[PDB]
Amino acid sequence: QNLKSTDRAVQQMLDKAKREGIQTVWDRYEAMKPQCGFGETGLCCRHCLQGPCRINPFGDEPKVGICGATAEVIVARGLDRSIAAGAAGHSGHAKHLAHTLKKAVQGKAASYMIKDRTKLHSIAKRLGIPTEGQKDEDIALEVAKAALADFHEKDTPVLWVTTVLPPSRVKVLSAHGLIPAGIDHEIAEIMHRTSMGCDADAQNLLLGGLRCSLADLAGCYMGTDLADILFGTPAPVVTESNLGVLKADAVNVAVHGHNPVLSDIIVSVSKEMENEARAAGATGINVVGICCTGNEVLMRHGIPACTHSVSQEMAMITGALDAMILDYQCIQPSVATIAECTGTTVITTMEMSKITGATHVNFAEEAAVENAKQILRLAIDTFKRRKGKPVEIPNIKTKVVAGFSTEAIINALSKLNANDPLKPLIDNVVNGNIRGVCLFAGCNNVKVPQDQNFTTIARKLLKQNVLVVATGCGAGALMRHGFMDPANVDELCGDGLKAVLTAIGEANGLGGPLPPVLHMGSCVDNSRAVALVAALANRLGVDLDRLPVVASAAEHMHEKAVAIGTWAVTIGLPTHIGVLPPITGSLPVTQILTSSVKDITGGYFIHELDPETAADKLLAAINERRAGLGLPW
Amino acid sequence: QNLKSTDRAVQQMLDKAKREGIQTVWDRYEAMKPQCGFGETGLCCRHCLQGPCRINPFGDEPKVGICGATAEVIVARGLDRSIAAGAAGHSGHAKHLAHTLKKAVQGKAASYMIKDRTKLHSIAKRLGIPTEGQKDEDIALEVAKAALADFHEKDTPVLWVTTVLPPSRVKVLSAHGLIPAGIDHEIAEIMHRTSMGCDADAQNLLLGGLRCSLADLAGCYMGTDLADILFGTPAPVVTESNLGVLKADAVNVAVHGHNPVLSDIIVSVSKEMENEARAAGATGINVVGICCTGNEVLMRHGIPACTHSVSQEMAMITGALDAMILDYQCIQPSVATIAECTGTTVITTMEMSKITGATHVNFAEEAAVENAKQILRLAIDTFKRRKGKPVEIPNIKTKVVAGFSTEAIINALSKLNANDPLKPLIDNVVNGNIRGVCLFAGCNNVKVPQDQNFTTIARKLLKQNVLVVATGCGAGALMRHGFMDPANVDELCGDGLKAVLTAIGEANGLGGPLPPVLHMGSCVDNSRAVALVAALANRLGVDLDRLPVVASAAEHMHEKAVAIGTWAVTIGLPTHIGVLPPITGSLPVTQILTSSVKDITGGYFIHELDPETAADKLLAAINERRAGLGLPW
Ligand code: SF4
Ligand code: SF4
Ligand code: FES
Ligand code: FES
Ligand SMILES: [Fe+3]
Ligand SMILES: [Fe+3]
Structure with a gap:
């Protein structure tokens, strides 16, 4: 199993998955070999219904796409679309935080507030928003409005690019026309220029890709700025990581995905609910992190990290994971199937990210504390169903300063x-x-x-x-x-x-x-x-x-x-x-x-x-x- | 050749291409068979670097993507991205017209004006823009601002959806959450939700696709509205179609692509330049249409349609096509290679749509008449180079009322x-x-x-x-x-x-x-x-x-x-x-x-x-x- 993962806790769970007949990501990967060489080299195009088109990396025909698209065009177009999709994920995350801050400051979501007013003011200063004599709520409203404005064309370029890099860097990029004009504007222009019968020059295409990648930077930077305002800027913390942070005698609740607008509320509310959990026979609610939303609440609250990325199914294989609370990005949809075997309650919360067979809770910032309690109560119920089941939590964890x-x-x-x-x-x-x-x-x-x-x-x-x-x-x-x-x-x-x-x-x-x-x-x-x-x-x-x-x-x-x-x-x-x-x-x-x-x-x-x-x-x-x-x- | 095209003019050119050794779209298609069955059925995914993933339509493993994505998820995600790419093309076209109208009405592009003021007023009325007592230029500025606003979230949904369908239809769609909130917003949300580890429910995914398709409708409708304001609403016209509309004794100039902001100027300017052309030994400038930008100037000006879509290379095979003026969409990039054989000057004009080996002219609305003359003068020069060459224009054309x-x-x-x-x-x-x-x-x-x-x-x-x-x-x-x-x-x-x-x-x-x-x-x-x-x-x-x-x-x-x-x-x-x-x-x-x-x-x-x-x-x-x-x- 050490050819699959160097993590010893993951190896132990892989052994458990194998003897229990639960298919894993590594099994599905083995079932995929040999993978397609055209896809792996990038010499495949499906951007119109005359396709699929492919190009032999070496040898005889096919040498060129049906419309005449060369290998360099097909490869550059595929790469550009993956940059745009990445930009769309980071920018959707940031956009959802911008709306959350706007609603909080307009009195529409009392669960959310300005927690880091120092960060709020330095951001507004960096953007050119005036702060002297202004209420914090008015400054924040201006910051949220400026974030949302960077998604479309306006009289300025994307400020979460131009105000966060040194002027010399901005000038080098402006000289090559690489400054984004709007985050969603650049995403849509990539999809346009890469569609059939449009941009067909490898250098032109890749220059568009560099510009769209700066739209992705802006979404990352905006996401970090807004999360710090809303939830606090991280400072050094001490916690633990790996599967041994699960506890058999507790309600174990994983937060999984990327956007903490959800999971930060879970963290605070779960503390309110320790007494519900004890009433069910748990020591308490044990919130743990998976992937980046786990990183968010690890950075801000010291929530221990359970696992990450490719090994995320193994948290469920322990048998001790009572709930897995999902927002979006990097969630293997297999978790909804594996839950049938492991007992875990998998819960989706975002309208545009559902998984067939998972329970969906329509999270809304306006109702965040209510939603948190509904989710956590499902986790409590799941703990009661396994009172008296054997679990296998590998007793493996590390100390993490973060x-x-x-x-x-x-x-x-x-x-x-x-x-x-x-x-x-x-x-x-x-x-x-x-x-x-x-x-x-x-x-x-x-x-x-x-x-x-x-x-x-x-x-x-x-x-x-x-x-x-x-x-x-x-x-x-x-x-x-x-x-x-x-x-x-x-x-x-x-x-x-x-x-x-x-x-x-x-x-x-x-x-x-x-x-x-x-x-x-x-x-x-x-x-x-x-x-x-x-x-x-x-x-x-x-x-x-x-x-x-x-x-x-x-x-x-x-x-x-x-x-x-x-x-x-x-x-x-x-x-x-x-x-x-x-x-x-x-x-x-x-x-x-x-x-x-x-x-x-x-x-x-x-x-x-x-x-x-x-x-x-x-x-x-x-x-x-x-x-x-x-x-x- | 009748197995390739039912069009007799295209068949004659296919015979010419074959004996001259010029590869065509049909030859490249033949070189592609047998096409990939995974791509053709939709059971292939390359949305992350663990791929490419495929699913056998029938039989044994692979049955599921590496991350756990099912056949229905992979197919729905691929379809959603093609809808979003289509929306991005139609919306980019409309966006470029919105900017053109704004610049025209702010005095920044004197080649462009409000040509259909009746259309301008009915659109503004349909959008709720007040017209009584307003200058046309102010109304148009409001219309252009409203068009650009529909690309992003705001306090209203996309008005080029909600104001163009009957209220009962809008209500049926709102009930299912299908009204777009912003054109580029919906495009980016499709790319987000279809990226790895996000939406994994076929029905949820397809409902997002229907919503993004309404963002595409809005871009189409906005594109038609703005082109009619700028260039006039079409009224019945009589012209001709097919390759026989080329004339050996004239400078033959094809407008090819989709956006007429360019080609409408070409039409007017070429008339100014009949005397330049005669000086070179031509009877005149013969502007003809290919694909949708040809349809635009056919609808408004009676410009004859030379050919379309899959057969576009055959206009060049005649030997009589002196220039092909490109903007974007549905242009086979092979035209830049075929031009080396046929003598045609292929000219790109849009920043995000270039073709390796074609001449690029940086078109700008501010300089449209100047750019038109530079392009047409290249066409005149090309005509002089073929004075005394034999051409083969099939003597085949139809009468077209449009x-x-x-x-x-x-x-x-x-x-x-x-x-x-x-x-x-x-x-x-x-x-x-x-x-x-x-x-x-x-x-x-x-x-x-x-x-x-x-x-x-x-x-x-x-x-x-x-x-x-x-x-x-x-x-x-x-x-x-x-x-x-x-x-x-x-x-x-x-x-x-x-x-x-x-x-x-x-x-x-x-x-x-x-x-x-x-x-x-x-x-x-x-x-x-x-x-x-x-x-x-x-x-x-x-x-x-x-x-x-x-x-x-x-x-x-x-x-x-x-x-x-x-x-x-x-x-x-x-x-x-x-x-x-x-x-x-x-x-x-x-x-x-x-x-x-x-x-x-x-x-x-x-x-x-x-x-x-x-x-x-x-x-x-x-x-x-x-x-x-x-x-x-
Ligand atoms: S865009 Fe060109 S290369 Fe891609 S599928 Fe269509 S014909 Fe083939
Ligand atoms: S998203 Fe899933 S199915 Fe698609 S390539 Fe990645 S692992 Fe394979
Ligand atoms: S990725 Fe295999 S041929 Fe398309
Ligand atoms: S389209 Fe052929 S396997 Fe991907
Ligand atoms: Fe991750
Ligand atoms: Fe066409």
Whole structure:
């Protein structure tokens, strides 16, 4: 089972699933081999009913699509649509938060409020919204109106792009026409230009893709901004991760999906309901996280993370998961079928994300506390049905220090230099205690033994004194393998990096270092890494493509992740991906993404499937940036 | 060659292409067989990087996607994305017209103006925009602002849906939550909900698709409204069609694509430039149409239609096509390669629609007349290069009466009843001289011998006294085979229908009938058929799903056509499609689209590949509506 997942708790559940005849994601993957080579290389098109069209990667006919579309056009069009779909997911998440803030501040949803008024004011200041003499509710209404305005064309471009990157970067992008005009505007234009008989120039198509990826960045950044206003900016927290955070004697309730508008309410309400749960024979309600909505409530509330991404079915296989509360994105629909075997109550809550066979509760912000209680009462009922059943919770968990928002990282650094908090970080970059910065982002992927790329790459970078930050299921992989436990700094970290983590941690009243990896939050919270990197660039007086900063989507899967990696390249970062998207069928497209995009944005993709080799290439990328700044390496 | 196209001019060019070694769309289609069965049935998914996933239509594993996505989910998600892509094309077209009108009326583009002020005022009245005491330029600015506002969420739903259908229809759709909230909003929500790990309920997914198809209707209707304001509402015109409208001794310039903002300027400017052309040795500039932008300038100016859709390469094969001026949609990118052989100057003009190897001219409304002259001068230069080359223009053309906007049809009927113009039409429906109405819409498709379905179905319906209206390349097919020539009424039309066409034509000072088929315009002008049908429903006091009105997308291809057929079903019409979209791999999805959608909207799809059988099924659908109204049939 270690060929399927490197996580020991997942291996134990895989053994249980096998002997109980419950099919898993890995079984369905095995039933799919050999996968289609046309799809895997990107040489397939179904964008009109003369198709499906395919192109042999090598050999004889077919060489060209029926309408005349070349390999490079078909590949670029497919890639553009996956960026647009990713932008649509991140932007829908942000849009739903914008409506929630608007309703809260108009008195239409009393369960929601301005929890971080400091964040509210700095955002409004960044957007040019005046704050002096204004009520908080009026400022917030202006912020929510500005968020919603960025989805369509207006007299300004998308402000959640132009006000969050350095002016030099914005200018490089405006020069190439890459600034989005409206988030949903760019999504629709991608679908238009990629439909039959429209854009048929690989470079033109890919430039549209870079622009749409910046619409995705804007949705991520807007999502992080609005969630922090509504639910609070994360600060350092201590919790646990992996399946052992389930408790047989408690009502175990997983929050799963991406948007915390739902799950943050669940967290608060479940505390009100401890007495209901005890009445049923539980010790209490044990809310745990799966995927990014789990990351959200982990970052803000210390809710323990149960599992992530590809292994999400195994939380149910324990037999102890009484409810799984879903909003949208990255939910394997198999959970609705597996629930018939495991007893779990799977509950959908969003109108546009239902699963056949799951119970649906029509969540509304106006009725959030009522809905939470209805859902949690179903979880209580499910616990009573299993009172007296054996469960198999693997007794495996790690300690997780997390909550490292960019504001938290600044604050932590400020204990070393109050009025110039970025300087201690840059000092240790310059003197070599910090070789560079690597962000791990994105999903797990059944194609890759779970967590194997994240941990292998992280281990080599940390020994080489790279400061490693992480989001999404990359944070989940690293967290479940001990990389967020400061007790592992001695084992994992090079001497220079250990010295820096120790200095910062000691100055922050901790008695020990910061953890080996800094957890920056959910997938939209990749925007926090952008805020940190832009602040470093501004403090250094250079553009982002001169910083020793790289990204690694080491095991990615989702269209959202494809978009993130694309905007990481567009804002100037060398960006490793550990699973190839369907692009190898066009050498010209591959050359653009790995080489010539350098001349447009200064970033570039690093395609490398072997993780030890990927780590070497990321180190080389970091060290080239170091040399370009005149630094030793 | 008659297995490839029923059009004799196309057959002659196919013979020329074969002996000259120029590959055509039919050759590329032959090089594609056997096409992928997974793609053709819809049982393939590439929406995440764990894919490609496929499902055997029958037999053993794979039975389910890797994430657990069932056949019905995979099929419904693929269909939803094709509706959204179609909506994105029609809405981009309309959006570009909205900007053109705004710039014209703000004094930013002097080449554009309010040409139809009657249309401008009736639209503003329909939208609730006040007109009394307002300058036309201020009313138009309000209309353009309202168009652009329908692309995003606001305090009203999409007005180009709710103000163009009868209130009873709007209410049926609101009850099912099918009213779009914003055009680009719905497109982005489709891409979100269909991405990995989101909506996984076939009925929920398809209800989203019906809503997005109404966003496509709104873009069509808005596109027609704005083009009529800017360029004039069509009125009856006489012209010709097919390749014989090319002239060896003239500069032959094709306008090709969809958006007439470009080609309407070309038409006017080319007249200014007759003397330049004569100086080069041409008789003049001969502008001809291809595809829907050809339909636009045919409807408004009587520009002859050269060819359409699947046969567009054959206009170049004559050797006489000096320029092909492109905007976007339905352009085979092969034209840029074929131009190397034929001498044609292929010119792209839109920023998001370029073709490798074609010349690009950056069209801007602010500089439209200048751009037109630059393009036409390239066409003149190309004519000089072929002075003394042999051309092979097949001497084949038909006479085409067209220009039947809904306003023109009302006006024509008003000569029989001035103050109740719809009544003579309804009279002859009731007494049986008109059995019903059939709209032919959509593309040609290389899978179907060109025009064979359109003409076979039209012939049987016309003998059965159906009033036949047509748009897009369905109008092109019928027009190139004589169905728009009133001289063919005796041969084609049943006695009841002939009597009605003759009565209307005689009352309109024509000496003969209306043509056998009424040309309602381009693809977005399918909205005119909606206006006509809604007006009939309102005059009759019933909803559209009680009218003896059907639609036939007899040979369709493009994602735009998939969307149109879907909203034809959503507004209540039995809707035949003559090529199946990728849906046969899910019987539950097929059952929804062909049967149970009846209970939601009253419309339904008719899947029928055999055209004689399709005609019988359309007649049965028309006759069931007749019976439901208590009429003989
Ligand atoms: S758009 Fe072109 S390549 Fe794609 S399916 Fe249609 S004919 Fe084939
Ligand atoms: S979304 Fe599901 S079915 Fe589609 S490619 Fe990904 S794993 Fe396969
Ligand atoms: S041929 Fe397999 S993905 Fe299309
Ligand atoms: S397997 Fe052929 S279309 Fe995907
Ligand atoms: Fe996840
Ligand atoms: Fe066409």
